[model samples]
Target: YKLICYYTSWSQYREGDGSCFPDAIDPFLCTHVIYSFANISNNEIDTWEWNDVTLYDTLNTLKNRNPKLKTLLSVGGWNFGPERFSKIASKTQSRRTFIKSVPPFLRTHGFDGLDLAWLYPGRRDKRHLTALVKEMKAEFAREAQAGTERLLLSAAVSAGKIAIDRGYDIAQISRHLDFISLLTYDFHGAWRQTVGHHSPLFRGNSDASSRFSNADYAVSYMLRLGAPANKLVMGIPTFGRSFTLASSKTDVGAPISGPGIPGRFTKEKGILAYYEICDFLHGATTHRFRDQQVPYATKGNQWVAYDDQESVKNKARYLKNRQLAGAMVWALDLDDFRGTFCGQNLTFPLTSAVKDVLARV
Candidate 1:
């Protein structure tokens, strides 16, 4: 039930000092951390040619710093699709090849589990996807039964009807997963061509629909589809999307005032990554919102939508009310480490606040 922090390899680029984990670790509320893109074609796995000694040394260093932390290797992100998976899951031989290759890799690298992040498995081909998961479960089960160390298995799933209805057989897939991390953000953005709430509780008809917010819809959909609530972890985004406004009064589908600009220390212009945003907020960013409970910020013509501590508390309350599993942040590198966004001097106060709220409940 601890908050999970998922970080990508871009984090290393964000911190050029060669100490990626030092800048990345929160040391407060994050109990599980998933370093993504480890198996991608061009990242650590590719660059090192799946070198176990190097990978394990890096992971061991991080584990030494936070002995209680559970680190997992996340494979197959949004861009990497069924083709790569097919190469490994198309047949039993391929599956066995992968299973044999991964265990030694994991033991050598100090990872506690494997996280599958195929964006939408069955959307393209349900038969292949289902077969893959089924084969993987069987392989893992065999390993577990043969006295191999127990290892966690998880997946990052799209929090939408398409994903729920077509991408996976929830009941069958859930049996193999430790938890399914549902991406509950990104419901509203430039792709939608509207200035709607990014993660609202209800869609506003007149900019105030009561049907469902991104989080509410995602959690509700998973439960309705047969996934246990305790095994569902809600995802929160640390980054915000930009919308170009044509005119201040035109509320719907605002034209492209300009290319979408990202936030900079809560001022305007220049997009900051999670860690950069955190540092900037600690010094420069100030928060203002229509509802103190829901977060929004305005700087001249641009409007940025994102979550704050209060909103996080609200979501945590929702989880408690539903008796659901805990929540997760997209990345830990984005919070204001000093006191710009939430008036707190830590990078993970929002996560800590979630735990506090859960304890109170």
Candidate 2:
């Protein structure tokens, strides 16, 4: 079982309690710690930020504390999007140049492997996506001839129906990649006109698109599409998607005028870190739905749908019951890693709950 925890690349810039650097990570908390992200510069693997090498050194050093832990680097993100990926994967020579650059980059940086997160692949990208992973895996195998560990390859994939249908050739990709991380969160967000839980484990009976809008459906759909159970990593967010309610009616399907007020720490309009959410819940009215198996809180005209320790544990059990690989947290930075917020005296409350359950047989 793998508990893959992602550390957002830009989190080091956050101030005060929100600041997250490699030092803040508890190595024992996760089986793998992946840094997101290093980008495609000149069609070759390269650092995106000014101090990525510095961060990479600090992050890889965590393995000294937990020798069993694996550290990998994720390439691309939502911010990086899908264009550059298409540019490279479109041509075999372009793909080879990118692939040739991967090993040296990983070995030089002390990373154990590479994780591709093109954000998503589109209808035309299906063939190229498979070829890219297949070639990368072959190169990794050839490079490991000197008795070194072969580089692990994984991808963070979309969870929606259309994205899945148009994006992945699941059977081919699954065979070449070590594991697939399902972005099961973000099912709903401030982009929508109505309020909804961004990561509900199950959909409510009254919810429209009930067949396609929740974690259960996403996981089952992936498995049915031929992704092996042991190679699926279910995503569990350490943050919440928020909304600014149009009225006092703050139900799951209520109208939302816009995104929620930005968090004092995160400063994102539609997202709230678990630590920030802890503060938001102080005077908020929270509702936990039996059907949804998740909770949402309303404070005045603001509403946020997010995972609590309870719901995260529920997801843990859900994955284990389904015989999936393990749980992957969207980020380590967003959790109350400092133990100051959430008033629980527990650092990373949501992630800790997941580890407690998943670590069990």
Candidate 3:
């Protein structure tokens, strides 16, 4: 029943909206909070993007109020690519160097684990990742023998079958990770030419895509590939994917030729935070639920695919029923922080619903 959430450092700059500092985190909602990134530079981990040492201290000290909360430093993200990781994971010396630095760094700043967050590793890098993890576990065991607390090792991985198989050796990967987070969203996004459910629980009939497109198939594939269900974490996006509706049909597998216009603050093309979509919902009278058991909103010729309380709760129930480790929020900050936007006026509406639903079981 672990609720893992990511807290990105850059999420703070919200066009002068209150900066989402570590202190603002709702520690009670989740068990594990992964600080989005600490980079890998010249075979060593660096927190160069993070402003200062005080931030680390403040982050770690969060345990003072919520002793149950464990934080992990996620090294690499979308911003970092494979070249640096390939260099580090390919050789024993580089691996050892990074390993040597990790324990002391965690000890100095107060962290319980390290999560490898490479967006997606290639087939070749898969073997390298295995070797690195094996070595990492060995070193971690040695540290435990020396009376240091055992640290967790995990990763964020792609969910698509092609990418999943290409990027991971599931059996070997499962052997090393405390848990592997399958990015269950992004199945459909502005990246695609057609409008589809971003996080469908089961494949909708209209989907002629491979069995790998839905959350069920992805999780099943990984489990069949020898990943223990208990070591698998499904991703839940607190945001939505937007695109222009090619026709008046706003159905799940509706026609769409291209992406929608970008947002003002987050500004990423065809992506909107739940809060942004919250505003979109105000003018848009119709928010509909599709057969896939997910929600979508349409405004004029524009459409968005996103998860709200119902969708998030459904995924949480999936996590519990399948005996999977838990649901990992793609990020913590993207959820409505102020509570003013959503009709419910409850902060963290989606996550809060998730927690309540999952906790019931």
Candidate 4:
């Protein structure tokens, strides 16, 4: 089974043990690692962080520790927005320039391939997205003919039905991509006024929109759209979505005041890294929603829904049952990578849990 781990470049700046430098990564932990969010500048691929060049060198060197480990560079995250991708991919000239730059950039930086994470394409950008992928695939094939290892191509795609229908011609894109990374998490979040689990394995009893949400539904949707099971990687998040409850009641679908107070480390209002969640759960009340196959923790007004070792193991089992390609965690840094914060002793408990389940044939 393939374990795709993503490394967010900004995580190096996180506070305390929360900071995860490239060196902290266990190369043997994942079969493949994706460095996230390289930007597009002047229609060419460029590094987002000022120290990206040095970081890239350090990250690629991890391969020395585990020769079988493969690394990929992912471009265009939510922050990157869709406008630049739409502009670069809309024209053949721009697309050519972009495609022409990738192989060299990847080889120069020691990346195995590219992962396009355009966030999404609207109705008009749909055709352009497909064209961009197809053209890149052709260029990669041509480059491979020159006797080099073929650069792998993939996309981190949406799990929502609207985005899938509006932004992707799945079957066409599937033909060009080596694999499709399905972002199966973030089905619900603090963005909604109501309290909801960010990533539910199944529809909850109180779920009104379960048909459109939940991991199982998303996977089935991708399959229905002709994405091959073997080439579809399900996403598993390393963080939690949180909200401030309006009342004392704390359950899925309860009304919320706003995003939960920022985690001490992550500092994001609506989200908490697994380490932060661990801190919150120290004296917090916890509950397991057996029906949904996930858990939630409450501390005063702050309510959080997140995956634990048990939940992620359940996800691993689900993926195996469905015959999906494998699991792709949103980030390695967000996990309790240092192991101290979570009191689990073992580092990367969530990621390790997934691997343990997957390793069992």
In order, the Cα lDDT scores of the candidates are 0.62, 0.90, 0.81, 0.89
| Deviation of model 3 at 197, angstroms | 2.0
RMSD for each of the candidates: 4.3, 1.0, 1.8, 1.1
**lDDT for each residue of candidate 1 in 248-285, tens digit (9 for 90 to 100):** 74334455454346544333342333333343343333
Q: Which structure is stronger by TM-score: 1 or 2?
A: 2
Superposed by TM-score, candidate 2 places the C-alpha of residue 236 at a distance from the truth, in angstroms, of: 0.3
Tens digit per residue, CA lDDT, model 4, 65-97: 899889999999979868878888898999999
Error of 2 at 81 (Å): 2.8
Please give me the total number of clashing residue pairs in predicted model 2: 0
For each predicted model, how many residue pairs clash, with residues at least 3 apart or on different chains? 8, 0, 0, 0
Q: Over 4 Å off in model 2, which ranges? A: 208-210
Candidate 2, 148-258: lDDT as tens digits: 989999999999978999978999999999989999996883355998888889967766665697889999999999999999999999998888889888765688789
Which 10 successive residues of model 3 have the least lDDT summed? 283-292
Off by over 4 Å in 3: 50-52, 189-191, 246-249, 252-257, 285-289
The C-alpha TM-scores of every prediction are: 0.81, 0.98, 0.94, 0.98
State in Å the error of residue 337, model 2.
0.6
Q: In model 3, how large is the Cα lDDT of residue 193?
A: 73
Model 2 residue 131 distance off true place after TM-score fit, in angstroms: 0.7
